[PDB]
Symmetry: C2
Subunit: 413 residues, 2 copies
């Protein structure tokens, strides 16, 4: 009858900023860009010229080659990051607790690279040479499916697919599962491997991607000259745990998740609603969920994708929700450094929000060279800010009108 408290007890990540959480976070707080020339595909025929890729990531350092060969990159990242998160949590998933340990990991795009290569085989060799592994490799739920198997996690089990809101919805949904007592632990987050021919083709065809060839200025959220997002890849996975459970086993606690809000624009298939009204409502739902006043928010990790419409409408939504306080709190987009990881965005950004609180550091928005009159909040430009944080809000305002907000709190007994 009483809501369970839910704390963060482990973090795992692969990002363009590093192949673990520490490296990723350390790079973020020093304003290091993960954006560079596209190498994953031939960029000659695309308007987009840069991307945020994993660097020096060899999957075989983490599993047998034969296991990796039966996983699309998106699943590879999720299994690697999930194992990292569980090891960080020092959680021993035994037969006794397996039914109370679940997995809720989403992907926005799933195994598009596998679909592409398998479709080419279909065209040339026929349907009878399609791989027996094609379907399980391509479907987005196989990140959750493979993590479950790798971990022996037999509890509540799902996969949310909501475009850019994916990682944030997934964490909120997992939070709600534990809150109502249906699991003691959830391994949750987002994963994405969207650097593929069709993905670049598709996000260039609707001009969503920046065509800025200069990696030093391509991703520049809130900058007057921003012109679209820079696509990235990776996974961000956390371990959510019921508080008493965590305390009883001596878990380390990063902080507490206290609010989740989800709304829809009901407006347009790709264009965000005017003045960010849907995003404003999602922030408001999350604030009400956390039981706090808006003034208690110290820092907002913005969605901040560096498109014209997002950054402008998100600024407006923030002003609508926080009024005078909107100019008092700090806002930043770490996509200035990581690029937009799509379905994994909310996962990595949840991790940055959590570490911001734990370590008392706000990561900066880099690359703001020309201020935009319509984006006039404090975006923590250029340099990290050392500061004690009690509450941090993270937005994901995804294509398709999916608005998702999480609120994290410093852990106090």
């Amino acid at each position: 009858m009483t809501k369970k408290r839910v704390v963060v007890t482990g973090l795992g990540a692969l990002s363009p900023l590093g192949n673990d959480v520490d490296t990723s976070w350390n790079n973020a707080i020093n304003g290091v860009s993960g954006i560079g020339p596209i190498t994953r595909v031939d960029a000659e025929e695309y308007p987009a010229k840069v991307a945020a890729e994993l660097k020096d990531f060899n999957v075989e350092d983490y599993m047998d080659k034969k296991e990796a060969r039966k996983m699309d990159r998106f699943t590879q990242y999720a299994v690697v990051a999930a194992k990292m998160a569980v090891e960080d949590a020092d959680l021993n998933i035994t037969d006794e607790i397996a039914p109370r340990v679940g997995v809720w990991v989403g992907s926005g795009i799933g195994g598009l690279e596998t679909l592409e290569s398998q479709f080419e085989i279909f065209l040339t060799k026929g349907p009878r040479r399609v791989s027996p592994f094609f379907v399980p490799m391509m479907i987005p739920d196989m990140a959750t499916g493979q993590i479950s198997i790798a971990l022996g996690a037999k509890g509540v089990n799902s996969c949310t697919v909501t475009a850019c809101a994916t990682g944030t919805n997934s964490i909120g949904d997992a939070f709600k599962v534990i809150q109502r007592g249906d699991a003691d632990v959830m391994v949750t987050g987002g994963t994405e491997a969207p650097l593929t021919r069709m993905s670049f083709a598709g996000f260039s065809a609707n001009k969503a991607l920046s065509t800025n060839p200069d990696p030093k200025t391509a991703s520049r959220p809130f900058d007057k000259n921003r012109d679209g997002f820079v696509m990235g890849e990776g996974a961000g996975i956390i371990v959510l745990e019921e508080l008493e459970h965590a305390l009883a086993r001596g878990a380390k606690i990063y902080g507490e998740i206290v609010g989740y809000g989800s709304t829809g624009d009901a407006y347009h298939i790709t264009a965000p609603a005017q003045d960010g009204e849907g995003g404003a409502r999602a922030m408001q739902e999350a604030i009400k969920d956390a039981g706090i006043a808006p003034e208690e928010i110290d820092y907002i990790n913005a969605h901040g994708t560096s498109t014209y419409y997002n950054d402008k409408y998100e600024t407006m939504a923030i002003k609508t929700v926080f009024g005078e306080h909107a100019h008092k709190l700090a806002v930043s987009s770490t996509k200035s450094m990581t690029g937009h990881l799509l379905g994994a965005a909310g996962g990595i950004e949840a991790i940055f929000s959590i570490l911001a609180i734990k370590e008392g550091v706000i990561p900066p928005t880099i690359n703001i060279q020309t201020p935009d009159e319509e984006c006039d909040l404090d975006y923590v430009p250029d340099e990290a800010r050392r500061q004690e944080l009690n509450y941090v809000l993270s937005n994901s305002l995804g294509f398709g009108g999916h608005n998702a907000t999480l609120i994290f709190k410093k852990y106090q007994s």
Copy 2:
């Protein structure tokens, strides 16, 4: 912790058994098969030869061609079925209630036909010929996305993608949204248009599909000679509503949703877990959620896909959970008639579970000709059964170890 009661006030469906709920349901209770030769693709080079396709469905009867051209079939089905459910519910979505009306519709496969045609354009004509609408057309969340826009629904929204469990998870997740107080109305279920070249190739390559070329016997859940599933398409969408809200607007109530269980096998990417242990646990969680004794379950709408291992293991799971009662309750698989609608399966089967209670009729499992010693429960063979039902349980035991169970109850 808020605990609202959640009732079903509207139903909408497209299935191989009919292009609305009334037709689908009436055919189901009359044991009509929706399975025939594949026409959507040329099956000559494919191992599988039959499928369960929509009959005489022309999307232009429901929207302008220009609107349909911007939707993959999976989205078309979702929008048509959702509008049918909202009209059935006689629900008027206004600015005033919009933020309290959400959408949670899943798809297991999303817009694979669009992805195939657009990628073939890429290969032959280059990336500049790829449509600006490609991404939003292909991604599974755009069923929820387009439904939201069509309805003006501004509340909690999401898309669950969990293979065969998709429709059942989606409805359960929407149930929990209303239960904790975060929406007054949810339009929820599953949609699927999986009859495509790569889908047929893929589910034949892993041997999941039946290669039985005879449509009269292809889908035969619990039969000794069952040899894989028959693929179908469509959407099953329902309107869930908080009880006091439903009463305030004079809504008609089909029944109540009371239990939801979700587990994972943690076993294998495609093979079901031994002895259905994961499915057993999911049903037990749903039963615990509803706060009832197993003996109170009157009818189970099985997942019953007609694969060897699903039907055997689901039968074993049912015995594990219900003990001696497993031989007292009724079980049936409506996939014997509809085929396996994949991500939409849980949606249509939720609808059949709800109508079973409301109408007091249990739909049969057709096509069982050879009993299987291992599948020896009461599968309501061949003919529908008139019966007063208080509780119905619906399973979806999806590929990849996703187990989902819903329990529905008769409303006052």
